[PDB]
């Protein structure tokens, strides 16, 4: 009996089968509902569109995400997303397979509690297990000594791990992920003229970001270069047929990850929460935590990030310490790959939360078994 | 000791206020300027600091022909610029502190000026 | 010619006048810089708020403490806090009064050295003396034979004293005070849902701690009681207007003092460094050092600790010695009270470090005069 | 050398003299050109009428606004409007007076760049300055801590301000204003019969909106009240001589403001943008932003808007927080009044953009001086 590994992220939902090397079906986790007036009597107009279907029919919809900053705000439609991904996407019977769920560190307890309650009392799965994300990232990277930097569309957190021994007093969660990057971008386009207000236009801005924005190496120098118009400009063709040309704000958007004063936040950029998390650990651990900085999650897929990050760290760490960032080319699905690896381990398969244990204990059992 | 320090600080403020207002009144009465009675309310609009400061120095100081709050704050900014030009080093002294009438601070800069000249 | 006694703690600075019975003016020792963009031409805006002013005009500010863990890590603005105390809070001429400063045991020498240098070459005091924080406590309590345990926002001493004869091989220092308790509370508040991140919100968390947190008499019992909901919960009301309801993280925050593993530390709790500091002393002394445990410092004001500490010690010390914990009601200002006493002793005027001695000796005279 | 304060909004152009308490000249910013055939050989028929002149002779003109939604669309005639203001209404050679222009937040940079280029290279003004509107509104209201709801005929934008420190990460700009309300009104009239199509007919519809339309308090109740025909009907007399009678649509035109779904927009009414702009600011600031919501601009001169706004905000603010709406009587001109105050200060004079500086840097100097 195989198991289900659905990395129910806060942006796309990457789900699949325990054991494989790649998720079956991924898709944005947006539940859309029509807003315009419908006048055609003989239609099979569905109530609410969810997934890439909704992502296809935007100009009628109010796209809303159920998950914001990791936590789940609307529990009604998240049920719809799970229903969709179990029937229409994988076409499996949930009553047969154990399910693996992922989460971020420092999340409300009610989150995982109600998640378990919905997974059992509604889908009647045989067993369920929710595992922290940045541990599965190490799993997939095949290490046992790293300081993961998970970040995308939601939260951004480090979890230092020495030898299968996490250091829970040195994880550094931060709410500065791709969604805030997207909003800052669609706020900063207005300087050139193009305004994107609706949610159907927020998707267009996210898409611009995903394929036009890189990370500078030296931000001030790149800014001074872009002043004398040069090869920075790039043209993008909206679904309307018009073209826009963003020259300067191709690195000013993802520079937020390093100067979160651009959005009014006080925290220090990802180049420094990492260093603070390392310094929170023990002396004997820092020397080989500096060496394995696993990066995971989408937002770490900008072009020049595995280099500005490295420079910004070696500018902080002692002069005689070897820094290496481990950024695999599939650093977007690494969480799910680790999930598939873990759920297919001969040792682990006795750690699930079987339905018997839930019925004998209650939803407060995830805090006990996880 | 059920936190009795409140009354001690308030009486300290009173005994400082009496001496300070007597000094500023004796300074106002030399140049033919009307005396004041309230240390903490007759210094809001920041005008009385300006002529007092010019009598302390001996030069001219204009005033903005206004009466709203931003005019008071502009007057106090003038006062602080003048004070800084005489190397009077204040730290937690801002424009809004005077115009809000902050006892702990409104007799902090007076003591600064006193200690600078007298 | 009266003298000044400013217990420049690591949290709130408490200054005053020698001979008196209460500090004239106390205030948190935080220097804030405004971070947002200032657009109003006619304002007389300062550029550095400090003290209760910075504490109030808080939403615009990046609050920062100059003193951390007892030591001074920013001399640029610690000078500002001293300037504030001398000229605005007390309004006195430094060139007229001698100043008495306090410090913690086992502190870097450079700390007191630079403290003296700044107090002479900048404020031109005629005389200055720096005393250890856990002896003025005995002065204030009137004893001469005790084992002081002061703590709050940076340190936790144990200076056992038999008869004006401190035993410097039995002083235990431990950096487990108010600020670490505050950060731990702020970190466990997440699991309920509330998330305080910035410094302007760290202040609110500290204030939640001060007036909601108590120390359990039996932790493993209080925890199991708070499981079945009862009178444990409370309700703080932020300046936002929203209310929060912490029920469990009320004795789990200050339980850190007795189990420092809760924040990831090896060192044993304060209920055991006291016992170790006693056992390092002589046999003919422990038999009455047990009977005088002068608690001092801020963070020893929880509605608990004065009894759970005694309960935890009488389970270590032999069943014959009679244990007693002297917890006076003002066990907070006790250090400054002792300062106002010691500065007004007739037999003390031959202790100050006169300016002549500083000029003829340099700043390294503190080690030989203290 | 008194300066000029000409706030050229989207609709009316209110100009005057820096220092005084009232704009000298007020007139709509339309530029009319004839269309009908002209058959009279002696007439001195000018080329393009502009201003209230072009308003009175609007029977044979094609009225047209250069400014749409704050930004400027046609420059050849905005030049004409400035020329008109300087030479016919005020009659003052600009080569002597400085000039204080006003813009809106989040406007294309090229807008203010070309604006200053025109001001210096066609009028040779000695110095100019472009200041955001929702700051001048606070100036005029004499506050320093408010959240300015400015809205007339082109935009609707909040700018939260605590103490001279604006928060540019929290200004919300909804693009729905008087012109959209007018278009909706003229589109909703035609369900009773009256058809207004030409631009002159649009001016007539605006002259209706300005003096027959109020804001409901409980819109859903006002519907069913005006259902059973009652005192709601009014009778307005077109310039032709005939009369109309709009009963219901006099409170459905400005209810668009609170539900912009009536005109197909997706955004949230002016109450939720105010609440969101408050919630983006810091906890310490929300308390006294909730109390000073300075309304501004024309569109906020509807009769029952100060109370609908307050009810709607109290409905979503915390229960124990005090809400007060600062709606001055002459708020229409509040922006210009604040401009007159600001230019007449004494400290301001070092903020002008001297012509020498423009010759040095060029038009980009505005982005760094403003
Ligand atoms: N090529 C890319 N470059 C930059 N950012 C990207 C790229 N691809 C995806 N992202 C960002 O990653 C986010 C989704 O990443 P992911 O890690 O899957 O989020 P989640 O963990 O919530 O599933 C998107 O919001 C997008 O902003
Ligand atoms: N009643 C209280 N309950 C719990 N903690 C307190 C209480 N009063 C003060 N504290 C803590 O004590 C700290 C201040 O203690 P104090 O001894 O004045 O510091 P310092 O040693 O720097 O003077 C504060 O940071 C606060 O965390
Ligand atoms: N007395 C009024 N009652 C209601 N609405 C009005 C009134 N006067 C003007 N308006 C609306 O205000 C708009 C003009 O606002 P105004 O403040 O002139 O905008 P701007 O900032 O562009 O100058 C007009 O479009 C009109 O719809
Ligand atoms: Mg991820
Ligand atoms: Mg203390
Ligand atoms: Mg306006």
Author numbering:
A (entry chain C), C (entry chain B), D (entry chain D): 5 to 374
B (entry chain F): 18 to 135
Authors' own words:
The cytoskeleton protein actin can flux between globular (G‐actin) and filamentous (F‐actin) form, and this polymerization cycle is coupled to various cellular functions. The structure of actin is subdivided into four subdomains, SD 1–4, and contains a central pocket for ATP and magnesium ion. The presence and absence of γ‐phosphate at the nucleotide‐binding pocket induces conformational changes that leads to opening and closing of DNase‐binding loop (D‐loop), respectively (Kudryashov & Reisler, 2013; Merino et al, 2018; Chou & Pollard, 2019). Here, we describe the electron cryomicroscopy structures of phalloidin, lifeAct, and utrophin bound to F‐actin, providing a comprehensive high‐resolution structural comparison of widely used actin markers and their influence towards F‐actin.
